[PDB]
Design an enzyme around this catalytic site. Structure first.
Site, PDB file in Angstrom:
ATOM      1  N   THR A   1       0.850  -1.214   0.000  1.00 48.95           N
ATOM      2  CA  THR A   1       0.000   0.000   0.000  1.00 48.95           C
ATOM      3  C   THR A   1       0.873   1.246   0.000  1.00 48.95           C
ATOM      4  O   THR A   1       0.433   2.262  -0.555  1.00 48.95           O
ATOM      5  CB  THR A   1      -0.962   0.013   1.193  1.00 48.95           C
TER       6      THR A   1
ATOM      7  N   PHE B   1      -6.504   4.922   6.459  1.00 47.99           N
ATOM      8  CA  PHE B   1      -5.740   4.162   7.475  1.00 47.99           C
ATOM      9  C   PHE B   1      -6.693   3.425   8.428  1.00 47.99           C
ATOM     10  O   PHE B   1      -6.266   3.022   9.549  1.00 47.99           O
ATOM     11  CB  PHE B   1      -4.771   5.112   8.186  1.00 47.99           C
TER      12      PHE B   1
ATOM     13  N   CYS C   1      -4.581   1.576  11.179  1.00 46.82           N
ATOM     14  CA  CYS C   1      -3.191   1.282  10.754  1.00 46.82           C
ATOM     15  C   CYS C   1      -2.198   1.649  11.852  1.00 46.82           C
ATOM     16  O   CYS C   1      -2.031   2.808  12.175  1.00 46.82           O
ATOM     17  CB  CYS C   1      -2.798   2.045   9.495  1.00 46.82           C
TER      18      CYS C   1
HETATM   19  C1  MNH Z   1       0.074   4.009   2.646  1.00 53.77           C
HETATM   20  C2  MNH Z   1       0.343   2.924   3.354  1.00 53.77           C
HETATM   21  C3  MNH Z   1      -0.715   2.165   4.063  1.00 53.77           C
HETATM   22  C4  MNH Z   1      -2.151   2.206   3.899  1.00 53.77           C
HETATM   23  C5  MNH Z   1      -2.957   2.927   2.840  1.00 53.77           C
HETATM   24  C6  MNH Z   1      -2.611   1.324   4.979  1.00 53.77           C
HETATM   25  C7  MNH Z   1      -4.058   1.053   5.161  1.00 53.77           C
HETATM   26  C8  MNH Z   1      -4.598   0.251   6.215  1.00 53.77           C
HETATM   27  C9  MNH Z   1      -6.058   0.078   6.440  1.00 53.77           C
HETATM   28  C10 MNH Z   1      -7.221   0.692   5.712  1.00 53.77           C
HETATM   29  C11 MNH Z   1      -6.135  -0.791   7.614  1.00 53.77           C
HETATM   30  C12 MNH Z   1      -7.426  -1.223   8.291  1.00 53.77           C
HETATM   31  C13 MNH Z   1      -7.976  -2.379   7.458  1.00 53.77           C
HETATM   32  C14 MNH Z   1      -9.303  -2.906   7.999  1.00 53.77           C
HETATM   33  O1  MNH Z   1      -9.662  -4.042   7.590  1.00 53.77           O
HETATM   34  O2  MNH Z   1      -9.903  -2.174   8.863  1.00 53.77           O
HETATM   35  C15 MNH Z   1      -4.728  -1.052   7.998  1.00 53.77           C
HETATM   36  C16 MNH Z   1      -4.387  -1.967   9.061  1.00 53.77           C
HETATM   37  C17 MNH Z   1      -3.067  -2.480   9.323  1.00 53.77           C
HETATM   38  N1  MNH Z   1      -1.950  -2.089   8.538  1.00 53.77           N
HETATM   39 MN1  MNH Z   1      -1.759  -0.290   7.495  1.00 53.77          MN
HETATM   40  N2  MNH Z   1       0.146  -0.970   6.962  1.00 53.77           N
HETATM   41  C18 MNH Z   1       1.132  -0.013   6.555  1.00 53.77           C
HETATM   42  C19 MNH Z   1       0.814   1.056   5.639  1.00 53.77           C
HETATM   43  C20 MNH Z   1      -0.529   1.377   5.255  1.00 53.77           C
HETATM   44  N3  MNH Z   1      -1.622   0.753   5.687  1.00 53.77           N
HETATM   45  C21 MNH Z   1       2.513  -0.154   7.052  1.00 53.77           C
HETATM   46  C22 MNH Z   1       3.723   0.661   6.684  1.00 53.77           C
HETATM   47  C23 MNH Z   1       2.393  -1.253   7.943  1.00 53.77           C
HETATM   48  C24 MNH Z   1       3.445  -1.834   8.772  1.00 53.77           C
HETATM   49  C25 MNH Z   1       4.649  -1.298   9.000  1.00 53.77           C
HETATM   50  C26 MNH Z   1       0.989  -1.686   7.906  1.00 53.77           C
HETATM   51  C27 MNH Z   1       0.486  -2.740   8.735  1.00 53.77           C
HETATM   52  C28 MNH Z   1      -0.909  -2.814   9.164  1.00 53.77           C
HETATM   53  C29 MNH Z   1      -1.390  -3.756  10.209  1.00 53.77           C
HETATM   54  C30 MNH Z   1      -0.607  -4.775  11.004  1.00 53.77           C
HETATM   55  C31 MNH Z   1      -2.811  -3.526  10.300  1.00 53.77           C
HETATM   56  C32 MNH Z   1      -3.751  -4.234  11.221  1.00 53.77           C
HETATM   57  C33 MNH Z   1      -3.989  -3.390  12.487  1.00 53.77           C
HETATM   58  C34 MNH Z   1      -4.920  -4.117  13.489  1.00 53.77           C
HETATM   59  O3  MNH Z   1      -6.066  -4.500  13.089  1.00 53.77           O
HETATM   60  O4  MNH Z   1      -4.411  -4.353  14.628  1.00 53.77           O
HETATM   61  N4  MNH Z   1      -3.767  -0.565   7.061  1.00 53.77           N
END
Ligand code: MNH
Ligand SMILES: CCCCCCCCCCCCCCCC(=O)N[C@@H](Cc1ccccc1)C(=O)O
EC number: 1.14.14.1
Length: 454
Positions: A267, A392, A399
């Site tokens: 992402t 996010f 996130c």
């Molecule tokens: C731009 C970059 C980027 C976007 C658009 C992003 C978008 C999201 C979205 C939307 C969710 C919630 C999804 C849902 O089902 O509710 C989410 C959850 C998450 N994401 Mn991030 N993601 C990252 C970068 C992003 N994430 C990075 C960098 C990491 C790790 C270093 C990461 C690790 C996660 C993790 C782990 C979760 C789960 C959190 C939880 O439910 O405890 N991520």
């Protein structure tokens, strides 16, 4: 008490054949544009409701009323990501345990620690581009994926995927991309156990073995050294949850590594891809971002402090996430019977889908210029209502890597704008590829070095 719209049906299959496409989120965006802020979507033995308005999404985001649901999409990803943080239920023991164990990986002290590693991969990106011959182009998504995978490998697991030493994608990427592809292509399948999919099933298993084989190597490589590098893997192997006092078990660490490798790069790769697309199609905005990069990044190597100063590059990134949130949907279920929007009765367990890109185009929040790329929308963040910008996700299931991702993106875009002039030499027609996540496909540019030493 009003009835929801529903899109065209195909008899016994109801709405399912509308996802009979390689761009389902984009097809659902076109449906949201027809039917407005909410619609009912039915499949055999399933119903969900697609939300598009800030008015309904600010309710859906009430943690007292709705919890994170696993979409069919996430339920399919779970076949390889298990009870890792992204594909776990809030009520599973490992959800809160992991969340507690792994959040200090995202302290300000940890971020300052990752910075130098991020600069390491970013320099490999600038050098690749500095080293191109006259009239060679850049494959933008392919190169952003080189940076983001390398960056999470290094920062998270002190593991080098060495993506810039390959002209082909890393095998992990090939297997991940085709796993996410199969997850998405299962959604539309009326008859999933039809033997015409017996191949897809074996390819999916093969792709899961690649991903687990690389996990084995990351874990072996660390238990060898025994570091405690104050990184993500250190906490996964050594952190105790202060609630239960327990560490993660071996099976959950494996799923967390798979989870952080995929969510930790894919992402962010899309974000940088979309950010660079908008910059080349919007030269006034490109010049304002390039001026900020040149003025702020005075040192051959960006400092942590200097990335924090790139407000306009930040606004470019938020504006890119407004139009194309790269994780374009999250699912919720009603904790109890409740009324959505004083109009829509929901039963306990009822599923909602938040269609983030429609939310981001709500004209009652953003004004009538929603399609224009105007970073200036984010100059003053208070003026953005609660729950209008949700790239996010939401609340405690939001996130955890939000600051990591934007620090990475800001550092790398700053260095890109500082060191090169960009040319949309093909006049690229946006083509958005869906693997649950979103990314431009076929997006290429030429980068004329400004010849600033590194
Ligand atoms: C731009 C970059 C980027 C976007 C658009 C992003 C978008 C999201 C979205 C939307 C969710 C919630 C999804 C849902 O089902 O509710 C989410 C959850 C998450 N994401 Mn991030 N993601 C990252 C970068 C992003 N994430 C990075 C960098 C990491 C790790 C270093 C990461 C690790 C996660 C993790 C782990 C979760 C789960 C959190 C939880 O439910 O405890 N991520
Ligand atoms: C650790 C792994 C990280 C993986 C991240 C990928 C997830 C990020 C975005 C997922 C959004 C995808 C949206 C899918 C389309 C959709 O709305 N599907 C829905 C609706 C549906 C209804 C009936 C039958 C099938 C499907 C769903 O999956 O339930």
């Amino acid at each position: 008490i009003k009835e929801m719209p529903q899109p065209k049906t195909f008899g016994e299959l109801k709405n399912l054949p509308l996802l009979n496409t390689d761009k389902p989120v984009q097809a659902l965006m076109k449906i949201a544009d027809e039917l407005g802020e909410i619609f009912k979507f039915e499949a055999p033995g399933r119903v969900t409701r697609y939300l598009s308005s800030q008015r309904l999404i600010k309710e859906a985001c009430d943690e007292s009323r709705f919890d994170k649901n696993l979409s069919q999409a996430l339920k399919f990803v779970r076949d390889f990501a298990g009870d890792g943080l992204f594909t776990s239920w809030t009520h599973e023991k490992n959800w809160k345990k992991a969340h507690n164990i792994l959040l200090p990986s995202f302290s300000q002290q940890a971020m300052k620690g990752y910075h130098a590693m991020m600069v390491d991969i970013a320099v490999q990106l600038v050098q690749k581009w500095e080293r191109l011959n006259a009239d060679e182009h850049i494959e933008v998504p392919e190169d952003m994926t080189r940076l983001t995978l390398d960056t999470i490998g290094l920062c998270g697991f002190n593991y080098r995927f060495n993506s810039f030493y390959r002209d082909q994608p890393h095998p992990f990427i090939t297997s991940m991309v085709r796993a996410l592809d199969e997850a998405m292509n299962k959604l539309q399948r009326a008859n999933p156990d039809d033997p015409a999919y017996d191949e897809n099933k074996r390819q999916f298993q093969e792709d899961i073995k690649v991903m687990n084989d690389l996990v084995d190597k990351i874990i072996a490589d660390r238990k060898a050294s025994g570091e405690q590098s104050d990184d993500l893997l250190t906490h996964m192997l050594n952190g105790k949850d202060p609630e239960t006092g327990e560490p993660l078990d071996d099976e959950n660490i494996r799923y967390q590594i798979i989870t952080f490798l995929i969510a930790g790069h894919e992402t962010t790769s899309g974000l940088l891809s979309f950010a660079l697309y908008f910059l080349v199609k919007n030269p006034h905005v490109l010049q304002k971002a390039a001026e900020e990069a040149a003025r702020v990044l005075v040192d051959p190597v960006p400092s942590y402090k200097q990335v924090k100063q790139l407000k306009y590059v930040g606004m470019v990134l938020n504006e890119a996430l407004r139009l194309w949130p790269t994780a374009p949907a999250f699912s919720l279920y009603a904790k109890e019977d409740t009324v959505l929007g004083g109009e829509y009765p929901l039963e306990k367990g009822d599923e909602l889908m938040v269609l983030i890109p429609q939310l981001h185009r709500d004209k009652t929040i953003w004004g009538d210029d929603v399609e224009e790329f105007r970073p200036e929308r984010f100059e003053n963040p208070s003026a953005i209502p609660q729950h209008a910008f949700k790239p996010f996700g939401n609340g405690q299931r939001a996130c955890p890597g939000q600051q990591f991702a934007l620090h990475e993106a800001t550092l790398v875009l700053g260095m890109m704008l500082k060191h090169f002039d960009f040319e949309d030499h093909t006049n690229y027609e946006l083509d958005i590829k869906e693997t649950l996540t979103l990314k431009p496909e076929g997006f290429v540019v030429k980068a004329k070095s400004k010849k600033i030493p590194l």
